[PDB]
Coordinates of C-alpha atoms in Angstrom, one line a residue:
Chain A
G1 CA 34.6 97.6 118.8
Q2 CA 37.3 94.8 118.3
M3 CA 39.7 93.4 115.5
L4 CA 39.0 95.7 112.9
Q5 CA 41.9 97.6 111.4
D6 CA 42.7 93.8 109.0
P7 CA 39.3 93.1 107.9
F8 CA 39.1 97.1 107.0
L9 CA 43.0 96.3 104.7
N10 CA 42.1 93.0 103.7
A11 CA 38.9 94.2 101.8
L12 CA 40.4 96.6 100.5
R13 CA 43.3 94.2 99.3
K14 CA 41.1 91.2 98.1
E15 CA 38.9 93.7 96.4
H16 CA 41.8 95.6 94.6
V17 CA 39.8 98.6 96.2
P18 CA 42.8 101.4 95.1
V19 CA 42.9 104.2 97.7
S20 CA 44.3 107.3 99.3
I21 CA 46.8 107.3 102.2
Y22 CA 47.1 111.0 104.8
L23 CA 49.8 110.6 106.6
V24 CA 51.7 113.2 109.1
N25 CA 54.3 114.4 107.2
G26 CA 50.8 115.5 104.7
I27 CA 52.2 113.0 101.4
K28 CA 48.5 111.6 100.2
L29 CA 49.9 108.6 98.3
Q30 CA 47.4 106.8 96.0
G31 CA 47.0 103.1 94.5
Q32 CA 46.5 99.4 96.2
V33 CA 47.0 97.8 99.4
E34 CA 49.4 95.2 98.2
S35 CA 49.7 93.4 101.4
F36 CA 50.6 94.3 105.4
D37 CA 51.2 92.9 109.1
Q38 CA 52.0 94.6 112.5
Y39 CA 53.5 97.9 111.5
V40 CA 53.5 98.6 107.6
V41 CA 51.0 98.7 105.0
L42 CA 52.7 97.2 101.1
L43 CA 50.9 100.2 98.8
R44 CA 52.1 99.2 94.8
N45 CA 51.5 102.3 92.9
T46 CA 52.2 102.2 88.0
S47 CA 55.7 102.1 89.1
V48 CA 56.6 101.2 92.7
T49 CA 55.1 99.2 95.6
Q50 CA 55.9 100.8 98.9
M51 CA 56.5 100.4 102.9
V52 CA 53.8 102.6 104.8
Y53 CA 54.9 102.2 108.4
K54 CA 51.0 102.4 110.2
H55 CA 52.8 104.7 112.6
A56 CA 53.5 107.5 110.3
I57 CA 49.8 107.1 108.7
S58 CA 46.2 109.6 109.3
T59 CA 44.4 107.7 107.3
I60 CA 43.3 105.7 104.8
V61 CA 40.7 106.6 102.5
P62 CA 38.7 103.9 100.1
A63 CA 37.2 105.0 96.3
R64 CA 34.6 103.5 97.8
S65 CA 33.1 102.1 101.4
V66 CA 34.1 98.4 102.2
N67 CA 32.5 95.1 103.0
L68 CA 34.7 93.9 106.4
Chain B
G1 CA 40.0 108.2 136.1
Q2 CA 39.1 104.7 134.1
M3 CA 38.1 103.4 130.6
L4 CA 36.4 106.6 129.2
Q5 CA 38.0 106.6 125.6
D6 CA 35.5 103.8 124.9
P7 CA 32.6 105.2 126.4
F8 CA 32.9 108.3 124.7
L9 CA 33.6 106.8 120.9
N10 CA 30.4 104.0 121.3
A11 CA 28.3 106.9 122.4
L12 CA 28.9 108.9 119.0
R13 CA 28.4 105.8 117.3
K14 CA 25.4 104.6 119.2
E15 CA 24.0 108.9 119.9
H16 CA 24.9 108.8 115.4
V17 CA 27.0 112.4 117.1
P18 CA 28.3 114.3 114.1
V19 CA 31.9 115.3 114.8
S20 CA 35.3 117.4 113.6
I21 CA 38.3 115.3 114.0
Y22 CA 41.3 116.9 114.5
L23 CA 44.7 115.2 113.3
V24 CA 47.6 116.0 114.1
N25 CA 49.1 116.8 110.0
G26 CA 46.1 119.6 110.9
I27 CA 43.0 118.3 108.2
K28 CA 40.1 117.8 110.1
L29 CA 37.9 115.5 109.1
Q30 CA 33.7 115.6 110.1
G31 CA 31.4 112.3 109.9
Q32 CA 30.4 110.1 112.5
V33 CA 31.4 106.7 113.7
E34 CA 30.7 105.0 112.4
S35 CA 33.2 102.0 114.5
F36 CA 36.1 101.6 115.8
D37 CA 38.6 99.5 118.4
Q38 CA 42.4 99.4 119.9
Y39 CA 44.3 101.9 117.2
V40 CA 41.3 103.4 114.3
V41 CA 38.0 104.8 114.2
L42 CA 35.8 104.3 111.3
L43 CA 35.0 107.7 110.8
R44 CA 31.8 108.1 108.0
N45 CA 30.3 110.1 105.9
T46 CA 27.9 111.2 102.6
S47 CA 31.3 109.8 100.0
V48 CA 32.6 106.3 102.0
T49 CA 33.6 105.2 105.4
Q50 CA 37.4 106.4 106.1
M51 CA 39.8 104.7 108.4
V52 CA 41.6 107.4 110.6
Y53 CA 44.5 106.4 113.9
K54 CA 43.7 107.0 116.9
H55 CA 47.7 107.9 117.7
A56 CA 47.4 110.4 114.3
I57 CA 44.0 112.3 116.5
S58 CA 44.8 115.0 118.7
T59 CA 40.9 115.5 119.2
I60 CA 37.4 114.5 118.6
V61 CA 35.0 117.4 119.1
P62 CA 30.9 116.8 119.5
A63 CA 28.6 118.4 117.7
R64 CA 27.2 118.5 120.9
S65 CA 27.9 116.5 124.8
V66 CA 27.5 113.0 124.7
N67 CA 25.8 110.9 127.8
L68 CA 28.4 108.0 128.7
Chain C
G1 CA 49.1 89.3 107.0
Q2 CA 52.8 88.8 108.7
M3 CA 56.4 90.0 108.8
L4 CA 56.6 91.8 105.8
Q5 CA 58.8 94.6 107.3
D6 CA 62.5 92.6 107.6
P7 CA 62.0 90.4 104.2
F8 CA 61.6 93.7 102.7
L9 CA 64.0 95.2 104.2
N10 CA 66.4 92.1 104.4
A11 CA 65.0 92.1 100.1
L12 CA 66.5 96.1 99.9
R13 CA 69.3 95.1 102.0
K14 CA 70.7 91.8 99.8
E15 CA 69.6 93.3 96.4
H16 CA 71.7 97.3 97.1
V17 CA 68.8 98.5 95.8
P18 CA 68.7 102.1 95.8
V19 CA 65.9 104.1 98.4
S20 CA 64.1 106.8 99.2
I21 CA 63.5 107.5 103.0
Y22 CA 60.8 109.6 103.7
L23 CA 61.0 110.7 107.3
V24 CA 58.1 113.4 108.9
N25 CA 60.0 116.3 108.7
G26 CA 60.0 115.9 105.2
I27 CA 63.3 115.2 104.8
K28 CA 64.0 112.7 102.3
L29 CA 67.1 110.2 102.5
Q30 CA 68.6 107.8 100.1
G31 CA 70.6 105.5 99.9
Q32 CA 71.5 102.3 99.9
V33 CA 69.8 99.7 102.7
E34 CA 73.3 98.2 104.3
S35 CA 71.3 96.7 107.8
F36 CA 69.0 97.5 109.9
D37 CA 66.7 96.2 113.4
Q38 CA 64.1 96.6 115.8
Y39 CA 64.1 100.4 115.8
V40 CA 67.0 101.6 113.2
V41 CA 68.0 101.1 109.3
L42 CA 71.5 101.9 108.9
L43 CA 70.9 103.8 105.2
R44 CA 75.1 104.2 102.8
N45 CA 75.5 106.8 100.4
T46 CA 78.2 108.2 98.7
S47 CA 79.3 109.5 102.4
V48 CA 78.7 107.6 105.4
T49 CA 76.3 105.4 107.1
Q50 CA 73.7 106.8 109.0
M51 CA 71.5 105.5 111.6
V52 CA 67.5 106.3 111.2
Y53 CA 65.3 105.8 113.6
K54 CA 62.6 104.1 112.0
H55 CA 59.1 105.7 114.1
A56 CA 60.3 108.6 112.1
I57 CA 60.6 107.0 108.5
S58 CA 56.7 108.2 107.1
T59 CA 57.6 105.7 104.0
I60 CA 60.9 103.9 102.0
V61 CA 60.2 104.1 97.8
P62 CA 62.8 101.7 95.9
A63 CA 63.8 102.4 93.0
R64 CA 62.2 99.3 91.6
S65 CA 59.9 96.1 93.9
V66 CA 61.4 93.2 95.0
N67 CA 61.0 90.2 96.5
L68 CA 60.4 89.0 99.5
Chain D
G1 CA 59.4 111.2 140.9
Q2 CA 56.8 108.6 140.6
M3 CA 53.1 108.3 139.6
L4 CA 52.1 112.6 139.4
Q5 CA 50.1 112.2 136.0
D6 CA 46.5 111.2 138.0
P7 CA 47.5 114.1 140.5
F8 CA 47.8 116.6 138.7
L9 CA 45.0 116.4 136.6
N10 CA 42.7 114.9 139.0
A11 CA 43.1 118.5 141.2
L12 CA 42.7 120.4 137.9
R13 CA 39.8 118.2 137.6
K14 CA 38.2 118.1 142.0
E15 CA 39.4 122.5 141.7
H16 CA 38.4 122.7 138.1
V17 CA 40.8 125.3 137.5
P18 CA 40.6 126.6 133.8
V19 CA 44.1 124.9 131.6
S20 CA 45.3 125.9 128.2
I21 CA 46.6 122.1 126.6
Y22 CA 48.6 122.4 123.6
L23 CA 49.0 119.7 121.3
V24 CA 51.4 119.5 118.7
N25 CA 50.2 120.5 115.9
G26 CA 50.0 124.2 117.7
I27 CA 46.2 124.0 118.6
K28 CA 45.8 125.5 122.4
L29 CA 42.4 124.3 123.8
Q30 CA 40.9 125.8 126.6
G31 CA 38.2 124.4 128.9
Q32 CA 38.1 122.2 132.7
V33 CA 39.7 118.3 132.4
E34 CA 36.0 116.7 132.9
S35 CA 37.7 113.1 133.5
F36 CA 40.8 111.7 131.8
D37 CA 42.0 107.6 131.9
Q38 CA 45.1 105.9 130.6
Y39 CA 44.6 107.6 127.1
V40 CA 42.5 110.7 127.0
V41 CA 41.7 113.7 128.7
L42 CA 37.8 115.1 128.8
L43 CA 38.4 119.0 128.4
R44 CA 34.9 120.7 129.0
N45 CA 34.5 124.2 127.9
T46 CA 30.9 126.5 127.5
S47 CA 30.2 124.7 124.0
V48 CA 31.1 120.8 124.9
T49 CA 33.4 117.9 126.1
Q50 CA 35.6 116.9 123.7
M51 CA 38.6 113.2 124.0
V52 CA 41.6 114.6 123.8
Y53 CA 43.7 111.6 123.1
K54 CA 47.4 112.6 125.7
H55 CA 49.7 111.1 122.9
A56 CA 48.6 114.8 121.1
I57 CA 49.3 117.2 124.2
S58 CA 52.3 118.9 124.6
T59 CA 52.3 120.2 127.9
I60 CA 48.9 121.8 130.5
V61 CA 49.5 124.6 131.6
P62 CA 46.6 125.5 134.3
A63 CA 45.3 128.9 135.2
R64 CA 47.4 128.9 139.0
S65 CA 49.6 126.1 140.3
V66 CA 47.8 122.7 142.3
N67 CA 48.5 120.6 145.2
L68 CA 49.0 117.0 143.8
Chain E
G1 CA 69.3 92.1 111.2
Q2 CA 69.2 92.5 115.5
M3 CA 70.7 94.7 117.9
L4 CA 72.6 97.9 116.2
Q5 CA 71.4 100.6 117.4
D6 CA 73.6 100.3 120.7
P7 CA 77.0 99.4 118.5
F8 CA 76.3 102.1 117.1
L9 CA 75.7 104.2 119.2
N10 CA 78.5 102.8 121.4
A11 CA 81.0 103.5 118.9
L12 CA 79.8 107.0 117.9
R13 CA 81.1 107.4 121.9
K14 CA 83.7 105.5 123.0
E15 CA 85.4 106.9 119.5
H16 CA 84.7 110.6 120.0
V17 CA 82.7 111.1 116.3
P18 CA 80.6 114.7 116.1
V19 CA 78.0 113.4 115.3
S20 CA 74.6 116.1 113.2
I21 CA 71.7 114.8 114.7
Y22 CA 68.2 115.6 112.9
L23 CA 65.2 116.1 115.4
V24 CA 61.3 115.8 114.3
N25 CA 60.8 119.3 115.1
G26 CA 63.8 120.4 112.2
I27 CA 66.1 120.9 114.8
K28 CA 69.4 120.2 113.7
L29 CA 72.4 119.6 117.2
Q30 CA 75.2 118.4 117.2
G31 CA 77.7 118.0 118.5
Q32 CA 79.5 114.0 120.5
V33 CA 78.0 111.5 122.4
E34 CA 77.6 111.4 126.4
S35 CA 76.2 108.6 126.6
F36 CA 72.3 106.8 125.7
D37 CA 69.9 104.4 127.7
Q38 CA 66.4 102.8 125.8
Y39 CA 64.4 105.9 125.7
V40 CA 67.9 108.9 125.8
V41 CA 70.9 109.5 124.3
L42 CA 73.1 112.7 125.9
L43 CA 74.9 115.1 123.6
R44 CA 78.2 117.3 124.4
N45 CA 79.0 120.9 122.3
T46 CA 81.9 123.5 123.5
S47 CA 79.1 124.5 125.4
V48 CA 76.9 121.8 127.5
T49 CA 75.7 117.9 127.9
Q50 CA 72.1 118.0 126.5
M51 CA 69.8 114.9 127.1
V52 CA 68.6 114.0 124.4
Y53 CA 64.6 112.0 123.3
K54 CA 65.7 108.7 120.6
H55 CA 61.4 109.2 120.6
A56 CA 62.3 112.7 117.7
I57 CA 65.8 111.8 116.3
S58 CA 65.2 111.2 112.5
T59 CA 68.8 110.3 111.4
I60 CA 72.3 110.6 113.5
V61 CA 74.5 110.7 110.5
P62 CA 78.0 111.5 111.9
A63 CA 80.7 113.3 110.6
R64 CA 82.7 109.6 108.9
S65 CA 81.0 106.0 109.0
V66 CA 81.6 103.9 112.9
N67 CA 82.6 100.0 112.7
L68 CA 79.8 98.1 115.1
Chain F
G1 CA 74.4 103.5 128.4
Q2 CA 71.2 102.1 131.5
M3 CA 69.3 104.0 133.5
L4 CA 70.1 108.2 132.5
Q5 CA 67.3 110.1 131.9
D6 CA 66.3 109.8 135.7
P7 CA 69.6 110.9 137.4
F8 CA 70.1 113.6 134.4
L9 CA 65.8 115.3 135.3
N10 CA 66.7 114.4 139.2
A11 CA 69.8 116.5 139.0
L12 CA 68.4 119.4 137.5
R13 CA 65.2 118.8 140.1
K14 CA 68.1 118.7 143.4
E15 CA 70.4 121.8 141.4
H16 CA 67.6 123.6 140.6
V17 CA 69.1 123.7 136.9
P18 CA 67.5 126.8 134.5
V19 CA 65.9 124.2 132.0
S20 CA 65.5 124.8 127.7
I21 CA 62.8 122.3 126.5
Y22 CA 61.8 122.0 123.3
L23 CA 58.8 121.2 122.1
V24 CA 58.1 118.3 118.9
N25 CA 56.1 121.3 118.3
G26 CA 58.4 124.1 118.9
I27 CA 57.8 126.0 121.7
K28 CA 60.5 125.8 123.5
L29 CA 59.7 126.5 127.4
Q30 CA 61.9 127.9 130.7
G31 CA 61.9 126.7 134.2
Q32 CA 63.0 124.8 136.5
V33 CA 61.9 121.4 136.9
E34 CA 59.9 120.8 140.4
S35 CA 59.6 116.4 139.9
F36 CA 58.7 113.7 137.3
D37 CA 57.9 111.1 136.5
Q38 CA 57.5 108.0 133.5
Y39 CA 55.4 110.1 131.5
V40 CA 55.7 114.2 132.6
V41 CA 58.2 115.9 133.8
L42 CA 57.0 119.4 135.7
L43 CA 58.5 121.9 134.7
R44 CA 57.7 125.4 137.6
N45 CA 58.2 128.9 136.5
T46 CA 58.0 132.2 137.8
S47 CA 54.0 131.7 137.0
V48 CA 52.9 128.4 137.2
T49 CA 53.9 124.9 137.1
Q50 CA 53.1 123.2 134.3
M51 CA 53.4 119.8 132.8
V52 CA 54.3 118.9 129.8
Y53 CA 54.4 115.1 128.1
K54 CA 57.7 113.7 127.6
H55 CA 56.2 111.8 124.3
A56 CA 56.5 116.6 122.9
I57 CA 60.3 116.1 124.5
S58 CA 62.7 116.3 121.7
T59 CA 66.4 118.3 124.4
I60 CA 66.7 119.6 127.0
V61 CA 69.3 121.6 127.2
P62 CA 70.3 122.9 130.3
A63 CA 72.3 126.7 131.6
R64 CA 75.3 124.2 133.0
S65 CA 75.5 120.6 132.3
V66 CA 74.7 118.6 135.6
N67 CA 76.3 115.7 137.5
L68 CA 74.1 112.5 137.2

């Protein structure tokens, strides 16, 4: 397939779907996708928006499946 | 050889073959390949479709060998 | 989205916002973003400015959210 | 030197030489190289052909040295 | 910012500043930067000059801050 | 500096200098550099020539410093 990453991330963003982001260091982040670009995902929780490098993301697990 | 990754992934996709995806952080995911693009594999289980970054995948082990 | 990484880093830089940088090896660095370029972030604490490779950064957590 | 990776992999492939592939996550795979492309090696054992991402391979140790 | 990595490394080199290089595998190297190129840093201690791949470097901590 | 990686590797190769190659997974390999290309180093010991991916190498420590 082609050009699926961004539809996925935009669907999480627009639909405000809670996600679990599992990093290569074993940390698991939880929040909403606020925005993203070529290299980063901005992830918002109750406290803060943090900047996550995609290269460090293993998998993004949403609370529910999204339509792309 | 040349251009084998996508035939493999498409064969898993079309044939609905259960896979084990072993990530660089030691997590092992199980499900079916729903779709994929340059950078990601969308992996479906009973619960959810998650987005897996290829850069974090070490090996994809199918339940049976596939024809490319 | 597009071109968000640098606005984020520049906002941390200009606003002098303390950050926690979580590396792929589990080290957590704390300080202020002094500068950055394509590949590195220069992070200043009480003692020193160190050069952090972006490829080794998992997430940058600011003490407060920033305006991009 | 130049253009050695593929001669090595093709020699393992054509000669059917058993290999140990050591991944960045510490897993050690054993089998024969079935095929390979820019990004992946297809590794066959008694049970299955699995798809191994080169980016996750640290070293490929053959049971015997190969002629390139 | 732009083009900061090399000024940093050259300043360590020219000024002979002792550094701690923290690798993604947790090893910490100590010595002086002898030279560097696109991909590597040559690090000298009492015993030897070793070749360190930048892709494996998380952070370079100097004994004192440098002028770029 | 510029174009140092290959002079280093070729000097180890031509001079037959024993090396320790430290991989990102913590494995330490020992032998002589037999050859190398853009992506791999072929490392020979008493038993075998193995193919090491540069992306998995953290540092190459020679038994003695080499002239580039």
